[PDB]
Structure 1
Amino acid sequence: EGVLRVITRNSPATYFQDRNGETGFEYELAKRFAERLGVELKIETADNLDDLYAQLSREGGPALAAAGLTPGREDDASVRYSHTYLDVTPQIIYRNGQQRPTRPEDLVGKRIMVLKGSSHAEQLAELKKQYPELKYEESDAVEVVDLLRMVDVGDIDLTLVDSNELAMNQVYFPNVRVAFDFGEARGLAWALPGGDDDSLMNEVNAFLDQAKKEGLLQRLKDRYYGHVDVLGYVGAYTFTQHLQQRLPRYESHFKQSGKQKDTDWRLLAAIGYQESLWQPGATSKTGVRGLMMLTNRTAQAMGVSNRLDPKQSIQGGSKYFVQIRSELPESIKEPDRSWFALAAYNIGGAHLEDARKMAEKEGLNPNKWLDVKKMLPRLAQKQWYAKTRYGYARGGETVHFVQNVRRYYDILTWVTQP
C-alpha cells in the first residue's frame, strides 16, 4: 500500500530541507512512525496555521498534523489531538537594552507580533479582554524564526513563543531575552481530523507511548536543541596558537590533497579549521565527524572508511569540496566560484541555487558571490523562503561559515608567503 500524508510547517522546529535532505524534529518523528506502520511518508507543508487546520479538516485532506501544535480543547471533536510528546511553556521575549516587562499588563503600548491563527494569539486575545489597552499584530507571512529576528534587530518590541522554539533559536539571536513565563507547561500534540474512526488515532497514540518509554523522544529533544551550526570566529590569538600546536600534525595531509586535486592546500586547511579547529576526534549530534566533519553518507561516497583518521578525513572532505566546485554552473568564475563552493559545502547546492534564482529575480548577478551573499539570509524569512523551491534554511549561518573560512584562509596565506 501507500503512503501516510503528514501536514506540517516549513520551519526549523518542524520540517525543513538541508544539505543532506529532509530533517527536523516533527519530520524524524513522523518518519519513525510511518516506518512503524509500514508505509511511505508524504510531507505536505502548510502556507500558515489557518491553512494547516483548514487543509486538515477538508474532505480530501491529509491524515494528521505534526507541527508543534498546542491542543485547543477536548470538545470541538473537529480536530482531535494525540497524546503529548513534548512539554513547552509560552514565554514573552524582549530585546536587550529595553526594559524587561515583569508581568502581563506590562505589554500595553509595545509593538507585539504573533503568528496569525496561533494559540499565542488566543493567549493575547484573552489578555486583551482584561486590558483593552493591549495592542498586538498577527501575520501569515512570518514563522517564529521571523518573530525572533524581528525582536533581535529591534523591528518589534515583544513577542510570544513556546519555550522550545526559543531553545532551538536563542543562540542565533544574541539580543533576545526571556521576560517571563506566560501560562503553565502545555504538552505538544499531533492533530488528526475528527473523528468517527479511531483506528489511525489509536495507532498514533500507541507509537507515541513506548517512544516515550524506549525514550527516543528524549533522544530527539537533545538531537535538535541547543547547538550551533557554524562555529564562531576564534580570533587571532587562538588561531595563532593552533597554528603552532595543531597544523603541524596535519599539514602534510592538506598539502598532499592539494596536489592530488590541483587546488590551494591552504583553503582546504581553512575549511578543516572552520569545521573542527583541526581536531580529528571532533563530532556533533548532527552526525558529522572527523577533521572535516563529514556525514556517513558522504564519507562512504568519498572512500572514507574511518572518519576519525585525519588523513582520510582531509582527503574525503577536500574531495567533496573540489567536486562541489567542479559541479557549479560554469558561468560562475573564480574566485567567486570557490566562495560559492564553500557556501554549497555548508548549505547544499539546492538552497544555493534558490539564492541564485532569488538574486537574479531581485535584479542582481547570480554569478557574483557578493550579490548572492546578500540573498542567503533571506532564506530564514518566510515572506521570502516560501516563494522558493526548497524553503527555509538558516542561510545567514552559511554566510558566517564562508566569511570565516575566508578569513582563516587569508591568515594562512599571509603566514606562508612569499
Structure 2
Amino acid sequence: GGSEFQVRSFEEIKRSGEIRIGTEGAFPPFNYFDERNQLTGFEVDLGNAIAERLGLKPRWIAQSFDTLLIQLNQGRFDFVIASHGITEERARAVDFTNPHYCTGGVIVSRKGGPRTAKDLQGKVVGVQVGTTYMEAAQKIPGIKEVRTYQRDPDALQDLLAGRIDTWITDRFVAKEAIKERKLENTLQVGELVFQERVAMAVAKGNKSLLDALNRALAELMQDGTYARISQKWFGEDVRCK
C-alpha cells in the first residue's frame, strides 16, 4: 500500500495522533511473529506502552534488520525498536534513546564445540548481517570464515545442521532458543564476548522525538510498567543497572 515518508517532530506526530514504529520481527523473544502470525515480543509490548504513555496509537512496520536505520532516516517510521546496541558507528547515522535493556553477545556452539574467542581458531562462525555480532566476529582473527546471514534464526539452523561451528548472538535470544527447542543436551552457551546497551533509534537530528521517548521510558521505569513487561518476558528485570 505504500506510505508517506517523513521525518516528523514530536508535535507533528502528536497532531496525527499516531506513531509509526519500525522493528524487525525475526528476533525472538524481543520482536517476532508468533504462532498465530502476529507481531509480538518484549520490545513490541514496550513500544506499545511507550506509544500509550505518549497518548498515541502505535502503527507497527516490520522489515529486514539491515534496512531499519536507513528507512528510519528516509522517514518510513518515527522510531525503531529492534534490539539495536548503541555503537559509535551507528550513532553517526542515528540518535539513540537511553537504553531499554542491557545484554551481551555470546558464543553458542554444539556440545564440545568452541566456548571462547580463542577456541574460534580455524572455526566457521555464523552471524546476522549488520549486527554487533558480525562486527565482533570480523575482529577476532584466525576465524577461518565469518558466515553472514540475513536472519539470525538462519544461523541457528546452520549451527544445528553442522554447517558452522559457532553462532554468535544475543545472550537472551540464545537462552530462549535452547529452552524453546529443547536443545539443552545439544547446544552449549560459551563466553560473553561483549556487553551492550540496547536502545530505540530516531532519525539523526530528531531531537524533539528523542526527548519525548526518553521521558516516556523514564516514566515506565518509575511507574512499574517496565518492571511488569520485563517480568512477563524474562521473569526478571533486564534494565541497565
Same fold (TM over 0.5): yes
1:90 aligns with 2:113: no
Question: Residues 19, 189 of structure 1: CA spacing in aligned structure 2 closer, same or farther, 3 A cutoff?
Answer: same
Q: Deviations over 1:54-105 (max 9, x none)?
A: 21121x3211110111011288442011111111111100112x33x34313
1:28 matched residue in structure 2: 45
Q: How big is the shift at 1:216? A: 2.9
CA contact (8 A) 2:115 2:189 kept: no
Ranked by relative contact order (alpha carbons within 8 Å, sequence separation 6 or more), the top structure is 2
- Helix, strand or coil: the match of 2:101? strand
1:366 matched residue in structure 2: none
1:40 aligns with 2:53: no
1:170 matched residue in structure 2: 178
Q: Deviations over 1:361-407 (max 9, x none)?
A: xxxxxxxxxxxxxxxxxxxxxxxxxxxxxxxxxxxxxxxxxxxxxxx
2:148 matched residue in structure 1: 138
Matched residues in 2 for 1:18 and 1:133: separation?
A: 36
Which of 198, 206, 216 is 1:207 aligned to? 216
1:53 matched residue in structure 2: 69
Matched residues in 2 for 1:161 and 1:114: separation?
A: 7
Matched residues in 2 for 1:220 and 1:35: separation?
A: 14
2:200 matched residue in structure 1: 190
1:268 matched residue in structure 2: none
Matched residues in 2 for 1:133 and 1:24: separation?
A: 33
| Equivalence map 1:2-401=2 (5 Å) | 2-11=17-26, 12=28, 13-19=30-36, 21-47=38-64, 49-58=65-74, 60-73=75-88, 76-96=91-111, 98-99=112-113, 101-127=114-140, 131-140=141-150, 142-143=151-152, 145-173=153-181, 174=183, 175-183=186-194, 185-195=195-205, 197-225=206-234
Question: Residues 2, 85 of structure 1: CA spacing in aligned structure 2 closer, same or farther, 3 A cutoff?
Answer: same
CA contact (8 A) 1:15 1:26 kept: no
RMSD over aligned Cα, in angstroms? 2.2
- Helix, strand or coil: the match of 2:97? strand
Matched residues in 2 for 1:93 and 1:17: separation?
A: 24
5+ residue gaps, structure 1:
227-418
Question: Residues 170, 225 of structure 1: CA spacing in aligned structure 2 closer, same or farther, 3 A cutoff?
Answer: farther
Question: Residues 90, 21 of structure 1: CA spacing in aligned structure 2 closer, same or farther, 3 A cutoff?
Answer: closer
Q: TM-score, normalised by structure 2?
A: 0.80
Q: Deviations over 1:268-298 (max 9, x none)?
A: xxxxxxxxxxxxxxxxxxxxxxxxxxxxxxx
Question: Residues 75, 135 of structure 1: CA spacing in aligned structure 2 closer, same or farther, 3 A cutoff?
Answer: closer
| Equivalence map 1:402-413=2 (5 Å) | none
CA contact (8 A) 2:104 2:192 kept: yes
Question: Residues 118, 25 of structure 1: CA spacing in aligned structure 2 closer, same or farther, 3 A cutoff?
Answer: same
Q: Pick the structure with more strand per residue.
A: 2
Question: Residues 80, 115 of structure 1: CA spacing in aligned structure 2 closer, same or farther, 3 A cutoff?
Answer: same
Matched residues in 2 for 1:113 and 1:45: separation?
A: 23
Question: Residues 133, 120 of structure 1: CA spacing in aligned structure 2 closer, same or farther, 3 A cutoff?
Answer: closer
Matched residues in 2 for 1:109 and 1:181: separation?
A: 20
5+ residue gaps, structure 2:
1-15, 236-241
CA contact (8 A) 1:5 1:41 kept: yes
CA contact (8 A) 1:7 1:43 kept: yes
Q: Provide the aligned length of Structure 1 versus Structure 2.
A: 215
Larger Rg computed on CA atoms = 1
Q: How big is the shift at 1:116? A: 0.9
- Helix, strand or coil: the match of 2:123? coil
Q: TM-score, normalised by structure 1?
A: 0.48
Matched residues in 1 for 2:143 and 2:197: separation?
A: 30
Q: How big is the shift at 1:26? A: 1.1
Matched residues in 1 for 2:22 and 2:224: separation?
A: 24
Question: Which ranges of 4 or more aligned residues in structure 1 deviate by more than 6 Å?
Answer: none
Matched residues in 2 for 1:169 and 1:192: separation?
A: 29
Question: Residues 204, 74 of structure 1: CA spacing in aligned structure 2 closer, same or farther, 3 A cutoff?
Answer: farther
Matched residues in 2 for 1:157 and 1:20: separation?
A: 31
Q: Identical aligned pairs, as a percentage? A: 25
CA contact (8 A) 1:78 1:194 kept: yes
- Helix, strand or coil: the match of 1:67? coil
